[PDB]
Amino acid sequence: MEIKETYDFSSIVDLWNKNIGTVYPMNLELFKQNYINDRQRKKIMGAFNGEILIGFVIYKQWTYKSGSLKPNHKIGYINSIIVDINFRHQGIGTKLLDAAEEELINSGVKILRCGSDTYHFFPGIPLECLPSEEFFLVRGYKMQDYFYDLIGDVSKVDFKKPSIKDGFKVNVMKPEDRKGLFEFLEKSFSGRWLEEFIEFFQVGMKERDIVLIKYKTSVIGFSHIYDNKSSFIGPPIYWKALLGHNYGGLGPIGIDKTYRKQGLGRLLLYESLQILKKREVKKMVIDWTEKDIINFYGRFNFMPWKAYRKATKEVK
Amino acid sequence: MEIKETYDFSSIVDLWNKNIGTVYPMNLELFKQNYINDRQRKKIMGAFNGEILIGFVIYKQWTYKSGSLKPNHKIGYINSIIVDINFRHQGIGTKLLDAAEEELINSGVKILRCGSDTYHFFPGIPLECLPSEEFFLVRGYKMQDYFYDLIGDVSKVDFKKPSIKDGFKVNVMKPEDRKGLFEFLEKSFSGRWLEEFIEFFQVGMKERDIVLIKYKTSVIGFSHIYDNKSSFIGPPIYWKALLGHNYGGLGPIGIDKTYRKQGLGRLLLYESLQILKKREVKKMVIDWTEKDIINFYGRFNFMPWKAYRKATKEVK
Ligand SMILES: CC(=O)SCCNC(=O)CCNC(=O)[C@H](O)C(C)(C)COP(=O)(O)OP(=O)(O)OC[C@H]1O[C@@H](n2cnc3c(N)ncnc32)[C@H](O)[C@@H]1OP(=O)(O)O
Numbered sequence: 001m002e003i004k005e006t007y008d009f010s011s012i013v014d015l016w017n018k019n020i021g022t023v024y025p026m027n028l029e030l031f032k033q034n035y036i037n038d039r040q041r042k043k044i045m046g047a048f049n050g051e052i053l054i055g056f057v058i059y060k061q062w063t064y065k066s067g068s069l070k071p072n073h074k075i076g077y078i079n080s081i082i083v084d085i086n087f088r089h090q091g092i093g094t095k096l097l098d099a100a101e102e103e104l105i106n107s108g109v110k111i112l113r114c115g116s117d118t119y120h121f122f123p124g125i126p127l128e129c130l131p132s133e134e135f136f137l138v139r140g141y142k143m144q145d146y147f148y149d150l151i152g153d154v155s156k157v158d159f160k161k162p163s164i165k166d167g168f169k170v171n172v173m174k175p176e177d178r179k180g181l182f183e184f185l186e187k188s189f190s191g192r193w194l195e196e197f198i199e200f201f202q203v204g205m206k207e208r209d210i211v212l213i214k215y216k217t218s219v220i221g222f223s224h225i226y227d228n229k230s231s232f233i234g235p236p237i238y239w240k241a242l243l244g245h246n247y248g249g250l251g252p253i254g255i256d257k258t259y260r261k262q263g264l265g266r267l268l269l270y271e272s273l274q275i276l277k278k279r280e281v282k283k284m285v286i287d288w289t290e291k292d293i294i295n296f297y298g299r300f301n302f303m304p305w306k307a308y309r310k311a312t313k314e315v316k
Numbered sequence: 317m318e319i320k321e322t323y324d325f326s327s328i329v330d331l332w333n334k335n336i337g338t339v340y341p342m343n344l345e346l347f348k349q350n351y352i353n354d355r356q357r358k359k360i361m362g363a364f365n366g367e368i369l370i371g372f373v374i375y376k377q378w379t380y381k382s383g384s385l386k387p388n389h390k391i392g393y394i395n396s397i398i399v400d401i402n403f404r405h406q407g408i409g410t411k412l413l414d415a416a417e418e419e420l421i422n423s424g425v426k427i428l429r430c431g432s433d434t435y436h437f438f439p440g441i442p443l444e445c446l447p448s449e450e451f452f453l454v455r456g457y458k459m460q461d462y463f464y465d466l467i468g469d470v471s472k473v474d475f476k477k478p479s480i481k482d483g484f485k486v487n488v489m490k491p492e493d494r495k496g497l498f499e500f501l502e503k504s505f506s507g508r509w510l511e512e513f514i515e516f517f518q519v520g521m522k523e524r525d526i527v528l529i530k531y532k533t534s535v536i537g538f539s540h541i542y543d544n545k546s547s548f549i550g551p552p553i554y555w556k557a558l559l560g561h562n563y564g565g566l567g568p569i570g571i572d573k574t575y576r577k578q579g580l581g582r583l584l585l586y587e588s589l590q591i592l593k594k595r596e597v598k599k600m601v602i603d604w605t606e607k608d609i610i611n612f613y614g615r616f617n618f619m620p621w622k623a624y625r626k627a628t629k630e631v632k
Pocket residue numbers: 019020078079080081082083084087088089090091092093094095114115122124125126128129130131132134135136138611614
């Protein structure tokens with residue numbers, strides 16, 4: 001057996017699906033979109049028996065800015081790691097993560113994260129990969145809290161419009177709103193979400209995927225919505241193969257801090273969901289939510305669907 | 317609004333699917349099979365606005381034996397409770413569970429369990445119903461550990477036959493094995509699993525659904541396997557609508573205590589899965605497993621799929 005770099009995307013995806021495809025079905029389009037467009041220092045290391053790929057790890061160091069966050073070179077990420085089912089418990093996973101980690105460490109990493117990278121596949125260790133928690137524990141990762149993808153079928157429920165206090169308008173974005181939108185993000189969400197707006201517009205997000213809420217003329221919040229016409233495969237629709245015809249998604253969503261807790265997030269969410277409904281969306285997902293916010297979406301009939309555990313290793 | 321009994325099965329199932337059908341798709345056949353065949357003292361209470369059902373609770377007291385376990389009349393169960401999404405946070409759930417609980421209590425119940433009943437729909441509080449944990453907490457239930465349904469696609473992986481030490485044979489059950497099987501269960505699994513064998517044979521389980529392992533002539537273990545021809549809808553195939561064509565399942569599985577930890581459970585599991593594979597099964601589920609045993613199935617590529625929290629209220 002040898003460990004060496006591979007960018008044999010088909011073989012990786014094939015191995016991915018054979019091992020975990022029932023619950024994280026992967027396709028080449030998503031795999032390539034996410035791997036190729038990422039701007040971090042990144043690598044894929046494979047484990048090989050001769051010419052046969054038997055496992056891999058994808059890993060990154062935070063070397064590229066997130067909006068007005070500077071990169072923190074101390075942070076590295078394990079995007080994914082899978083050893084083929086017929087080669088488990090032979091130390092291969094170990095050798096792969098050793099190689100990843102030693103490299104990150106030599107280049108200055110001191111905090112190693114399970115998922116949560118830019119162009120992530122996973123917010124953390126999936127519950128479906130719960131037994132890997134012990135693999136990570138043994139290597140010095142500590143297990144922390146959970147995030148959840150939520151699922152709902154917006155074709156099945158009708159909801160009541162929240163009561164519009166006046167001045168506030170919710171609308172699908174137009175090209176000429178881009179200036180205002182960026183101005184709002186620099187103020188309120190100037191980190192990764194800003195960076196995602198910039199990068200997603202570059203990779204095929206369209207104005208139709210964005211809903212804005214304005215007070216008078218000022219942008220004071222947004223959502224990103226997805227359907228089966230969206231060009232960019234974002235996190236809500238990663239696992240669209242599980243979601244049927246007329247799939248969709250939503251996230252992220254935010255309101256200017258000074259307008260919070262007046263029912264405006266609820267209004268934006270309502271309107272975003274009506275747009276999706278009108279687009280004939282059925283099952284749809286809201287990705288990477290925290291526990292404390294689940295009820296916000298649950299009023300609209302969304303339920304936790306997948307769970308992911310945050311996990312972090314501090315380099316000694 | 318009024319609370320009163322309802323056996324309007326279609327309306328219940330309709331409400332069930334509108335609220336939680338994306339993740340627990342219910343059909344009338346399963347609902348009726350499970351509700352009607354249960355032998356416990358049982359009731360369904362509905363909440364109504366005039367003629368419209370807006371919520372329900374199904375509840376039971378342990379009044380019927382489990383194999384050679386006597387019923388423990390102190391145990392009651394909340395099989396399920398759902399309030400329609402357009403009527404939440406109006407106290408309806410409260411009034412329903414108050415009515416259920418007061419009745420159980422008057423009839424002698426002192427321990428109240430979330431799911432885990434005979435003919436259960438849920439081993440505990442589903443993770444997809446995680447926000448209800450707080451509903452139950454407020455009423456004095458304590459949250460305990462987790463159980464997991466596991467999922468795998470047996471069409472996608474080939475496995476190695478474990479090394480047969482001699483004497484042990486694994487075979488699909490025949491009618492004439494029924495005596496031996498019961499003899500083995502009275503010895504080794506004489507509680508609910510024995511009772512399930514008796515009752516499932518009465519409701520349409522066939523010898524083809526059972527695999528036995530024998531040493532010489534003695535039955536020393538079993539599994540129950542399911543495919544799309546099984547007549548009895550058991551727990552592994554409750555959520556078959558999520559599982560595609562050629563769905564299947566497995567569970568329970570057991571080995572005589574004196575033969576444990578010699579590789580025989582692994583051999584039985586291997587053979588059971590080969591049978592399913594030969595029956596062209598693809599996605600299949602292993603229901604209600606504990607954390608400590610997940611790896612046993614994970615060697616065969618099964619992964620946690622759903623999680624359920626045990627929860628118990630001790631009556632003051
Ligand atoms: C950010 C993310 O990628 S999260 C998702 C992680 N990936 C997955 O869950 C995919 C499916 N699983 C796998 O691919 C594998 O099981 C991996 C990658 C987790 C581990 O790969 P392997 O090559 O089997 O691990 P390796 O043989 O080095 O195991 C090292 C040690 O970790 C621990 N370990 C590994 N797997 C397990 C397990 N399933 N349960 C408990 N401990 C485990 C053990 O201590 C093991 O030593 P042992 O064999 O002496 O018991």
